[PDB]
Amino acid sequence: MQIEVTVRNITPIFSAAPGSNYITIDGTINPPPGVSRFPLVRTRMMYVAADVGDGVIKSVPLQIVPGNTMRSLLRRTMLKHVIEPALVEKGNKLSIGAYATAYSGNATGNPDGVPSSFDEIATMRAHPFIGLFGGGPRMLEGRLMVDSLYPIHTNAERILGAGYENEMMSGPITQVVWARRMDPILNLGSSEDVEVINGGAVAANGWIQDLLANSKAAASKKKGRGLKAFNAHEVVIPGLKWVWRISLDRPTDAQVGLVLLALNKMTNERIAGGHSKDYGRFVIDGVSLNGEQVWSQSGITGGEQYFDAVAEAIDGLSSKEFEQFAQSAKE
């Protein structure tokens, strides 16, 4: 089953790339040493072979959300919105290992090297949730394959293929957003501002005195840590139309129905990260099932046999498969 979810982020996208990146105040990424630089936390970037100029494929940077992040977003969406309410409305409860296996593929960091029986493998791949995300102590193949969230851009034209010339994007799609943390105690202004503080003016003056001592120590170092922190993070600019490729090799109809229910409940979900700055908010503007567009304003339109299958399976959903899926053979 081929599912293609074209979304539109209405907030910036921030999937933080690991690394030690810096930036000048003017906006130059990774400056040579000597000039003053601030920590930059770049967004996640996929190198893509693309056609720059004419017939000259080259590796260009295109900033994305990883398929692991979107796979866990899909997993936690169908978990918080479908699977957990189905378990709550009945008497079924999960162990902490079963909850850990359902949310992160495993209960412990150490798997057991023995694989499970063919009957249990077949029944877990027939399961609506466990078939999508087959983890556990004995590693199963989950039939859900989740691609990265690619922005519909020229740099991904060898990724996107034909049919994506509408709402086209060129050029840079990222922006460095600067964030500052000020010291609260420097923003104290009067005795009315300080009355909620134990000690008041004495404690405030002690905070200024420790900041002056630490500043003198840092000046002796240059020529603990305070609360001033001016820094930067690169985000992907809002308003982009993104492609999200979801694949299912011979799924049970309830499993693709569960993916459809999760895509229905992607409303009020954040894609990558930067929670407190409301980053990752998005609007789905299209879902195509095997190339057939099945999205409307009121969620998924059509595809009814998937929804009846997943409703019947959620009615038949229990905690027994989750418990014996997470049960280690070595334990």
Partner DNA sequence: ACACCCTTTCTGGAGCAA
46 is a site residue for a copy of itself (CB under 8 A): yes
Q: Which stretch binds a copy of itself (CB under 8 A): 137-145, 256-264, 299-307, 308-316?
A: 137-145
Q: Which stretch binds other proteins (CB under 8 A): 117-125, 222-230, 289-297, 309-317?
A: 117-125
Where the chain is discontinuous (C–N > 2.5 Å), the residues before each break are: 223
What lies within 8 Å, CB to CB, of 86 at 6+ separation is: 314, 315, 317
Q: Which of 106, 123, 324, 328 binds a copy of itself (CB under 8 A)?
A: 106
- Alpha-carbon span 206 to 108, nearest angstrom: 47
Q: Which does 170 bind (CB under 5 to 8 A by kind): a copy of itself, other proteins, DNA, none?
A: a copy of itself
- What tokens does 248 get? 């299912």
Q: Which does 122 bind (CB under 5 to 8 A by kind): a copy of itself, other proteins, DNA, none?
A: other proteins
163 is a site residue for DNA (CB under 7 A): no
Q: Which 8-state DSSP code applies to residue 67? A: H
Could you count the other beta carbons within 10 Å of the beta carbon of residue 53? 6
123 is a site residue for DNA (CB under 7 A): no
Q: Which does 254 bind (CB under 5 to 8 A by kind): other proteins, a copy of itself, DNA, none?
A: none
- What tokens does 39 get? 């920590």
247 is a site residue for other proteins (CB under 8 A): yes
Q: Which 8-state DSSP code applies to residue 63? A: E
**In the complex, minimum distance from the CB of residue 324 to other proteins, in angstroms, rounded to a whole number:** 14
**Contact at 8 Å (CB) between 63 and 12?**
no
Q: Name the E strands within 124-263.
A: 144-151, 174-181, 229-236, 241-248
- Residues in 31-50 at the binding interface with other proteins, rule: CB under 8 A: 46-49
Q: Which 8-state DSSP code applies to residue 80? A: I
What lies within 8 Å, CB to CB, of 277 at 6+ separation is: 11, 12, 14, 177
Which residue is listed with tokens 């038949």?
316
- Alpha-carbon span 324 to 119, nearest angstrom: 12
Q: Which of 56, 96, 162, 196 binds DNA (CB under 7 A)?
A: 96
- What tokens does 274 get? 């930067």
Number of residues that bind DNA (CB under 7 A): 6
Which CB, 225 or 250, lies closer to other proteins? 250
Which CB, 33 or 161, lies closer to DNA? 33
Q: What string of DSSP letters covers 215-238?
A: HHHHHHHH----S-EEEEEEEEPT
SS3 202: helix
**Contact at 8 Å (CB) between 173 and 240?**
yes
**In the complex, minimum distance from the CB of residue 247 to DNA, in angstroms, rounded to a whole number:** 31
78 is a site residue for other proteins (CB under 8 A): no
List the x/- string, 5-44, binding to DNA by CB under 7 A: --------------xxx--------x--------------
Which CB, 25 or 168, lies closer to other proteins? 168
**Interface residue list for other proteins (CB under 8 A):** 17-19, 46-49, 57, 59, 66-68, 70-71, 76, 80, 84, 87-88, 93-97, 99-100, 103-109, 111-119, 121-122, 125-126, 133, 137, 139-142, 144-148, 158-159, 161, 245, 247, 249-250
